[PDB]
């Protein structure tokens, strides 16, 4: 009898994790930090709704293709959502010039307030009632864009259009307007009478003049007329002037620009449900409490950061282990309080007393690691969504290699922080134990026997008040110096 | 006498690897991961041979350049090889819009079938052959690109062209056309008659009128007058139709675009040699085996990852020492099928036994850490070749910095990787001898003296069967604990 | 008495350090390598001026806005300082075709030598003299550029102009020229008479034919017509033709592009100072001594590498620990050349001398890991300034996230550097104390008891030059082997 041992914690943990050494490495404690589900709903962010484009497409909201519902209400969003393939488009087939563009546009801005500008009653000389088709059915019946006027000669006559509206707001207006392509000469006279025609448009910054380019094309929507359609910020106290005297699609709504800010325009299948979060993805929203996630690259909101992982595991504690008497041969379930510890072994005692000066003193630098790892992120690439049109593909790769190219980078940056600091944690509790054992060994010198177990016989009379000496760091030699003086002469004479 | 010793392996080796501390640091074993050889040829890829254009560029052979020659068989490739500046290209002088887009689609593309959509024949109203320039030679008579057909005024008559190809296959069809722009009034009328002309081009897609942009321009090839070409992709079940009256140079022959998937155009000097790869480089193929290249940038194929290094060499084994006695000197060039071990000096041993249940421990964790270095740079930057028009700097250079970009991050991941794990590498075999030595003064406690040189001297008789018990282990203190007790009492009262 | 201690260097040192693990740890030696300070200048590059631009715009001065200063003694320049918002652009209103385009070319390029080439007085069939406007003041007079002129027809007639120049020069040059959009018929016909006009270029590369688009524009500094500008580069031995019926703004002088290199057109609103630097940002100029700043992503020059940050401080040496009788209870003030060592306590000794063969051993490898550290980011992202217009955000969003996603990357690996082996150079620290002790226990073996607090008591009479014999790993334990054989048995029966 008369022993102490020095050992540490283990428990019914099963969690595992990795480093650059080892796979699978079961432990005591450990955090996972990779968020993997989503609840496959769009929902609003942070009390904020998306504007749901339903089978509409940006241009067929902003136009107004009869098919699609204007917001009267002038909402603010927190972003937009577009189906993959929109049905609502260009009714009227044609081109929208610089079309990506302005989809990037609405991606920083937040709320429109639709505003007249050309009341659809002001074209005294001209007709402002035949220019509806068979491509944009309203129940049924012939219709047109309801923010554009398809202006159309009154009487067989077409007076040239001079017309001017000045901006004399706070904000930006978005403004839209179109010119017309017919099939063929006799189509243009019909409508517009002056067989040649042209729609000028200018303020400070733009200057256009735009012409009628007549072909023979296929039926598109059951027409071989196209209309093709430009748009203009127009700055405030700035003002705009259009001049044609033939095939203007003349604007009468303009959009302000009322709140730019963070937003985006998901392609989402989805639909909304009555739901909210910080987090939305377009296959469904997440719980952005752990620090990453890999639902999808394409995540707006307060997100976690994305990595292309299927599991990412901090290791916090010890690894874990019977585990009989001592450090060398495993961790005791028996402590439990604390990580590493002691065992008394007593005239009176019976054993498993923790260290808590580096108990706790392990616990802080770990999770103060923890989060100091979580925050060294920050800064890390979130993807932003962009569009291109047929004829910018290498752009689109450039971008698109961009965007993976920092994701790889990031994603191979948490990794190897995790693989790191994990052979290190564990690294330190290892040598957090061979510490506690240095400790009493460097002071139970000459009056105790090194069982090279990890633990040690005392060649004197221990007392309980005397082992939380050792555990203290106060153990005197003196005070028991003589009494083990002798004893270990009789080991050396003993049987 | 009466001694063990523990040591560890050292051999002829003189590789020499790197870390963060040291500099050029012997070793007993280490692994070379960077490819920095090419054998100078272009070869297949696995294989499937390019397309190897000579003195031709992407334009040459597409629109047929009397001097490039069709490829009649309908070949597959793996990549394209093009000259850095090609001698065959536009023979007649002009311009070739989105041509850089042109060649980026040709990257995402493996095969065509050349497919006649509007045979030379079949324009009864107008010229099919008097369309051909001295800046074309064909075996020296003038001639004109293959593929496309200068129109001309038949009998002082231009009969306004309007003619359709409906795209009846299943794969989408490139289509080239073009338009000419003469010196003067007088050279349009005496080609067209009609003295104002156009070249209209629609589909579902595309609407385009076309003008003749007549001016004064210096002589290229000969000539002052110049063509411009255009490019669409025609879908399946669309049709394309063109009108015009002069200046039209019309497609006979469509392109098949019968098989996508992975590609590239090279720019390289080099010809085909008889020749298979798993990567082609612009200067040479590469023997694809290990993990990094320094070789070119712009490699194709299962290809190692390129770095900008000079030398990347993985530490796997000892540092390199005579070394006698213990560890603290040195390694043992005498222990062979092991890395650490032991040395007997026995009443009848001699010594040098290995401890593998350590020794292979330690080539199992670090061949494990050498493949884990290797795939966790799975997902590293593949360069991607692109072009860019003397009007697009700005990209160019944004295209470039973003290659050269990850290029320089992954170039330092690789290096402070092996650098890293390189000196945990040898930490880990230092950590491994100083473990060996401990396992075995844990059990001989009392019954020997520690040498301080890494060697211990048995108060006891040892015997070669006792010896394999601290090898294993097994040994216990009391089997030869009372042997011992008296020995050493004997020293402290030897002489 | 009969002692000796094991410990390391303290000072009056408070600089501190943060690791992976710990935040602010005092220690010993240490060096900052982030420049925070800049001294709010312009300043010339390594001997070489900024071309400063006033407040003017690349325009404003290429095309010689009167408000603008010509750069008579064609000089050469490090980098252009141009305002944020220019007050001398255009002052006749208009566009400028791949404006941003020919800023980009300005970074590339250091000299200018404007060229004659078409003399102001060479134009007999035409007013070269009435073309100014009062929207270009010269000392309050209508005026206009200075580089280009307004040619308008003489005697109500406008001869038809064709004219060339051939570049006979070694250089590429720049050529300018534009065409004039007039308010309405009227004042087309009242400058050049032809009421149908256009403006044709030709050179090998580039063929353009230009038409007047008339509208009807707000009055930007006073006017509604506008004027639209174009540009190229002509190479040597090639020619440029123009050939207009009117509306042509025709070159006078061009600008030879006499020297490329290194460049970059910086905004800032400074102004020059009489002051030099190798290294400038927009907001002032670095002390280029130090490796990472963080004054301005947009630095030129031989810079420090930019890291978005607020400290980045370097561990070189010790903790700092009083700190008494050996190395367990921290280091010691009295210790000074050399970081790890010893103390005497003799016969007649008191103490403290350094072991500099791990000493200097220690400053060896650290300094060697120090600039090793530094090196190994020579090959950081540099960010490089570019511009884009108002139909370009796409890009310059793209490329603002590739110069932010690089920034942050290496921010981060900056980090993550200085935190990692600032732990593993106070791990080796501990590692070379704990080593020093281990050297002196391993020869002082029998001789000498340990006393737990990092010092040994000797039982034989040590001698000082037998205490250079541990400092010099010489100490033979049999010289006094048998003089402590007896002192020990002593003790066990001593009192």
Redo the contacts between chains.
């Keep these: 009898g008369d022993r102490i041992c020095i050992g540490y914690h283990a428990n019914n943990s099963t969690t595992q994790v990795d480093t650059?050494?080892?796979?699978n490495v079961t432990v005591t404690h450990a955090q996972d930090i990779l968020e993997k589900e989503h609840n496959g709903r769009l929902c609003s962010l942070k009390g904020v709704k998306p504007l749901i484009l339903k089978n509409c497409s940006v241009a067929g909201w902003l136009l107004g293709n009869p098919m699609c519902d204007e917001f009267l209400n002038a909402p603010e969003w927190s972003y937009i959502v577009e189906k993959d393939r929109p049905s609502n488009g260009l009714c009227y087939?044609?081109?929208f010039n610089?079309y990506?563009?302005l989809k990037?546009?609405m991606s920083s801005t937040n709320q429109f307030e639709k505003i007249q500008i050309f009341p659809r009653s002001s074209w005294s000389n001209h007709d402002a009632s035949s220019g509806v088709s068979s491509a944009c059915p309203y129940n049924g019946r012939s219709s047109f864009f309801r923010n554009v006027v398809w202006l159309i000669k009154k009487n067989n006559v077409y007076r040239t259009i001079?017309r001017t509206y000045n901006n004399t707001n706070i904000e930006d207006l978005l403004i839209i307007w179109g010119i017309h392509?017919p099939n063929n000469a006799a189509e243009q006279i019909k409508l517009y009478q002056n067989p040649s025609t042209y729609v000028?448009?200018?303020?400070?910054?733009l200057?256009?003049?735009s012409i009628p380019?007549?072909?023979?094309?296929?039926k598109?929507n059951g027409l071989?007329s196209?209309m093709?359609f430009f748009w203009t910020?127009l700055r405030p106290n700035?003002?705009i002037?259009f001049?044609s005297t033939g095939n203007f699609i003349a604007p009468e709504y303009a959009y302000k620009i009322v709140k730019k800010g963070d937003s985006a325009i998901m392609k989402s299948e989805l639909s909304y449900s009555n739901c909210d979060t910080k987090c939305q993805t377009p296959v469904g929203a997440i719980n952005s409490s752990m620090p990453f996630h890999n639902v999808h690259p394409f995540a707006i909101g307060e997100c976690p950061k994305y990595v292309?992982l299927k599991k990412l595991v901090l290791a916090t504690g010890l690894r874990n282990i019977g585990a009989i008497a001592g450090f060398?041969e495993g961790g005791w379930q028996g402590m439990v309080d604390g990580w590493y510890g002691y065992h008394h072994s007593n005239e009176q005692g019976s054993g498993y007393a923790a260290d808590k000066e580096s108990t706790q003193k392990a616990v802080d630098?770990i999770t103060?690691?923890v989060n100091?790892?979580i925050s060294?992120?920050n800064?890390?690439?979130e993807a932003?969504g962009?569009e291109?049109n047929?004829?910018?593909?290498?752009?689109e790769?450039?971008?698109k290699?961009?965007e993976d190219?920092?994701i790889?980078?990031?994603?191979?940056?948490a990794?190897?922080?995790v693989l790191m600091?994990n052979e290190?944690t564990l690294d330190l509790h290892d040598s957090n134990v061979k510490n506690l054992y240095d400790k009493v060994?460097?002071?139970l010198?000459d009056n105790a026997?090194?069982?090279?177990?990890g633990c040690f016989e005392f060649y004197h009379r221990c007392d309980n008040k005397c082992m939380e000496s050792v555990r203290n760091g106060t153990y005197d030699y003196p005070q028991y110096s003589?009494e083990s003086?002798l004893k270990?002469?009789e080991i050396?004479?003993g049987?």
């Design positions: 650059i050494m080892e796979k087939p044609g081109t610089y990506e563009e990037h546009l001079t392509h000028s448009v200018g303020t400070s910054t200057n256009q003049r380019e007549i072909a023979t094309r296929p598109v071989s196209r093709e910020i700035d003002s002037t001049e292309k060398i630098g103060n690691k100091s790892i060294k992120m800064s890390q690439f932003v962009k291109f047929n004829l910018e593909r290498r752009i790769n450039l971008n290699k961009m190219g920092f790889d980078v990031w994603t191979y940056n990794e190897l922080l600091e290190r060994r460097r002071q010198r026997k090194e069982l090279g177990n003589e003086r270990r002469e050396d004479s049987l």
